[PDB]
Write a protein that holds these residues in place. Structure first.
Motif, mmCIF file in Angstrom:
data_model
loop_
_atom_site.group_PDB
_atom_site.id
_atom_site.type_symbol
_atom_site.label_atom_id
_atom_site.label_comp_id
_atom_site.label_asym_id
_atom_site.label_seq_id
_atom_site.Cartn_x
_atom_site.Cartn_y
_atom_site.Cartn_z
ATOM 1 N N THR A 163 -8.417 12.129 21.858
ATOM 2 C CA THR A 163 -7.115 12.618 21.397
ATOM 3 C C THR A 163 -6.452 11.510 20.536
ATOM 4 O O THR A 163 -5.926 11.792 19.451
ATOM 5 C CB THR A 163 -6.153 12.978 22.606
ATOM 6 O OG1 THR A 163 -5.903 11.818 23.403
ATOM 7 C CG2 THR A 163 -6.747 14.001 23.506
ATOM 8 N N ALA A 164 -6.548 10.256 21.007
ATOM 9 C CA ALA A 164 -5.949 9.100 20.347
ATOM 10 C C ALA A 164 -6.648 8.606 19.092
ATOM 11 O O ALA A 164 -6.196 7.605 18.504
ATOM 12 C CB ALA A 164 -5.798 7.971 21.332
ATOM 13 N N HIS A 165 -7.761 9.262 18.725
ATOM 14 C CA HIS A 165 -8.566 8.905 17.544
ATOM 15 C C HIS A 165 -8.328 9.900 16.461
ATOM 16 O O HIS A 165 -8.628 11.064 16.652
ATOM 17 C CB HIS A 165 -10.066 8.943 17.852
ATOM 18 C CG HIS A 165 -10.498 8.047 18.977
ATOM 19 N ND1 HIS A 165 -9.618 7.236 19.669
ATOM 20 C CD2 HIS A 165 -11.714 7.842 19.539
ATOM 21 C CE1 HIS A 165 -10.276 6.573 20.607
ATOM 22 N NE2 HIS A 165 -11.548 6.924 20.547
ATOM 23 N N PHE A 166 -7.799 9.455 15.329
ATOM 24 C CA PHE A 166 -7.527 10.343 14.194
ATOM 25 C C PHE A 166 -8.382 9.841 13.088
ATOM 26 O O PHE A 166 -8.904 8.762 13.205
ATOM 27 C CB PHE A 166 -6.065 10.276 13.759
ATOM 28 C CG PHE A 166 -5.121 10.985 14.685
ATOM 29 C CD1 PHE A 166 -5.105 10.704 16.050
ATOM 30 C CD2 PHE A 166 -4.256 11.938 14.196
ATOM 31 C CE1 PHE A 166 -4.244 11.361 16.900
ATOM 32 C CE2 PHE A 166 -3.387 12.601 15.040
ATOM 33 C CZ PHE A 166 -3.380 12.313 16.395
ATOM 34 N N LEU A 167 -8.439 10.550 11.975
ATOM 35 C CA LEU A 167 -9.291 10.148 10.856
ATOM 36 C C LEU A 167 -8.642 10.528 9.530
ATOM 37 O O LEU A 167 -8.323 11.694 9.279
ATOM 38 C CB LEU A 167 -10.648 10.856 10.991
ATOM 39 C CG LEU A 167 -11.937 10.390 10.302
ATOM 40 C CD1 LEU A 167 -12.555 9.320 11.141
ATOM 41 C CD2 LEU A 167 -12.949 11.509 10.189
ATOM 42 N N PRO A 168 -8.355 9.533 8.698
ATOM 43 C CA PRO A 168 -7.732 9.785 7.398
ATOM 44 C C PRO A 168 -8.736 10.404 6.449
ATOM 45 O O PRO A 168 -9.906 10.064 6.504
ATOM 46 C CB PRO A 168 -7.302 8.387 6.959
ATOM 47 C CG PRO A 168 -8.320 7.514 7.607
ATOM 48 C CD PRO A 168 -8.436 8.094 8.976
ATOM 49 N N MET A 169 -8.289 11.369 5.654
ATOM 50 C CA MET A 169 -9.137 12.062 4.682
ATOM 51 C C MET A 169 -8.272 12.442 3.504
ATOM 52 O O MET A 169 -7.133 12.870 3.677
ATOM 53 C CB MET A 169 -9.712 13.345 5.265
ATOM 54 C CG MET A 169 -10.072 13.291 6.731
ATOM 55 S SD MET A 169 -11.305 14.484 7.118
ATOM 56 C CE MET A 169 -12.804 13.596 6.501
ATOM 57 N N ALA A 170 -8.796 12.320 2.300
ATOM 58 C CA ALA A 170 -7.972 12.648 1.164
ATOM 59 C C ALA A 170 -7.827 14.114 0.952
ATOM 60 O O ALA A 170 -8.656 14.908 1.372
ATOM 61 C CB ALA A 170 -8.493 12.008 -0.084
ATOM 62 N N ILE A 171 -6.759 14.445 0.249
ATOM 63 C CA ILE A 171 -6.413 15.806 -0.123
ATOM 64 C C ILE A 171 -7.621 16.280 -0.926
ATOM 65 O O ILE A 171 -8.192 17.348 -0.685
ATOM 66 C CB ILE A 171 -5.175 15.769 -1.057
ATOM 67 C CG1 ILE A 171 -4.108 14.818 -0.492
ATOM 68 C CG2 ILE A 171 -4.631 17.150 -1.267
ATOM 69 C CD1 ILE A 171 -3.730 15.095 0.940
ATOM 70 N N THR A 172 -7.985 15.406 -1.860
ATOM 71 C CA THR A 172 -9.101 15.542 -2.785
ATOM 72 C C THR A 172 -9.258 16.860 -3.564
ATOM 73 O O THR A 172 -8.449 17.788 -3.351
ATOM 74 C CB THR A 172 -10.433 15.113 -2.113
ATOM 75 O OG1 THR A 172 -10.170 14.416 -0.883
ATOM 76 C CG2 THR A 172 -11.185 14.148 -3.037
ATOM 77 N N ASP A 231 0.861 -1.212 0.000
ATOM 78 C CA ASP A 231 0.000 0.000 0.000
ATOM 79 C C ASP A 231 0.891 1.254 0.000
ATOM 80 O O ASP A 231 2.105 1.176 0.234
ATOM 81 C CB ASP A 231 -0.878 0.039 1.251
ATOM 82 N N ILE A 232 0.228 2.340 -0.285
ATOM 83 C CA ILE A 232 0.767 3.709 -0.260
ATOM 84 C C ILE A 232 -0.459 4.587 -0.124
ATOM 85 O O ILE A 232 -1.417 4.413 -0.882
ATOM 86 C CB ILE A 232 1.560 4.039 -1.526
ATOM 87 C CG1 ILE A 232 1.102 3.253 -2.748
ATOM 88 C CG2 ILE A 232 3.058 3.764 -1.378
ATOM 89 C CD1 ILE A 232 -0.183 3.805 -3.365
ATOM 90 N N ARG A 233 -0.478 5.485 0.854
ATOM 91 C CA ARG A 233 -1.653 6.328 1.013
ATOM 92 C C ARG A 233 -1.367 7.781 1.292
ATOM 93 O O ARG A 233 -0.818 8.095 2.329
ATOM 94 C CB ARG A 233 -2.555 5.749 2.091
ATOM 95 C CG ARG A 233 -3.214 4.470 1.650
ATOM 96 C CD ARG A 233 -3.283 3.521 2.791
ATOM 97 N NE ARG A 233 -4.209 4.036 3.780
ATOM 98 C CZ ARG A 233 -4.224 3.685 5.060
ATOM 99 N NH1 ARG A 233 -3.351 2.811 5.513
ATOM 100 N NH2 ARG A 233 -5.127 4.196 5.878
ATOM 101 N N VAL A 234 -1.759 8.659 0.368
ATOM 102 C CA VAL A 234 -1.559 10.106 0.508
ATOM 103 C C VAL A 234 -2.800 10.745 1.132
ATOM 104 O O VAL A 234 -3.840 10.821 0.461
ATOM 105 C CB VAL A 234 -1.373 10.774 -0.879
ATOM 106 C CG1 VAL A 234 -0.477 12.019 -0.765
ATOM 107 C CG2 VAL A 234 -0.842 9.753 -1.898
ATOM 108 N N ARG A 235 -2.697 11.232 2.374
ATOM 109 C CA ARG A 235 -3.851 11.873 3.029
ATOM 110 C C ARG A 235 -3.650 12.737 4.287
ATOM 111 O O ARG A 235 -2.655 12.590 5.000
ATOM 112 C CB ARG A 235 -4.939 10.842 3.299
ATOM 113 C CG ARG A 235 -4.488 9.518 3.892
ATOM 114 C CD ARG A 235 -5.624 8.518 3.765
ATOM 115 N NE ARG A 235 -6.593 9.003 2.774
ATOM 116 C CZ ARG A 235 -6.617 8.586 1.509
ATOM 117 N NH1 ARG A 235 -5.776 7.636 1.085
ATOM 118 N NH2 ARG A 235 -7.444 9.080 0.581
ATOM 119 N N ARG A 236 -4.620 13.623 4.549
ATOM 120 C CA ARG A 236 -4.605 14.547 5.703
ATOM 121 C C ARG A 236 -5.008 13.756 6.959
ATOM 122 O O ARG A 236 -5.969 12.997 6.883
ATOM 123 C CB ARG A 236 -5.594 15.703 5.449
ATOM 124 C CG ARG A 236 -5.493 16.356 4.054
ATOM 125 C CD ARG A 236 -6.091 17.776 4.035
ATOM 126 N NE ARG A 236 -5.904 18.530 2.777
ATOM 127 C CZ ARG A 236 -6.879 18.808 1.898
ATOM 128 N NH1 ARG A 236 -8.126 18.397 2.111
ATOM 129 N NH2 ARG A 236 -6.614 19.509 0.799
#
Length: 129
Positions: A120-129, A1-6
């Motif tokens: 605080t320990a919960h993050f969420l991946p989101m695309a640049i989009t 895999d490879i993942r580009v995201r905020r």
């Protein structure tokens, strides 16, 4: 895999890697130093490098959260998914232990305090989009 995201965080901050290795969150959206590169190294073990800054985000033997371009075993973090559908990221230096977390002030947190369920320990991946 490879993942580009905020990497959005539950306390409404964004993981940002300074081009001198400072790791703090930002509120601005279209920053540029908040765009990450999610990389797979093994099992369900992952590594992240901010595209611009080029550093890596690690956790030392005692907990601190820093960055470098020199990888180590401190650069390895495991990516979970609580059923709330949020990810987590614990270290490899040693239930669950230490995670990549962020206070409501943008400043990160020290290992000796993190805990699975807190926001605080919960993050969420989101695309640049």
């Amino acid at each position: 895999d490879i993942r580009v995201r905020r990497l959005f965080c539950r306390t409404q901050w964004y993981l940002r890697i300074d081009k001198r290795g400072k790791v703090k969150g930002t509120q601005e959206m279209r920053n540029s130093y908040n765009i990450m590169e999610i990389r797979t190294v093994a099992v369900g073990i992952v590594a992240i490098k901010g595209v611009e800054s080029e550093y890596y985000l690690a956790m030392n033997k005692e907990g601190k959260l820093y960055a470098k371009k020199e990888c180590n075993e401190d650069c390895n973090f495991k990516e979970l998914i609580l059923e709330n559908h949020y990810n987590t990221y614990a270290s490899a230096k040693w239930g669950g232990e230490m995670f990549v977390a962020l206070n409501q002030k943008g400043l990160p947190v020290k290992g000796k305090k993190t805990k699975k369920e807190q926001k605080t320990a919960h993050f969420l991946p989101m695309a640049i989009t």
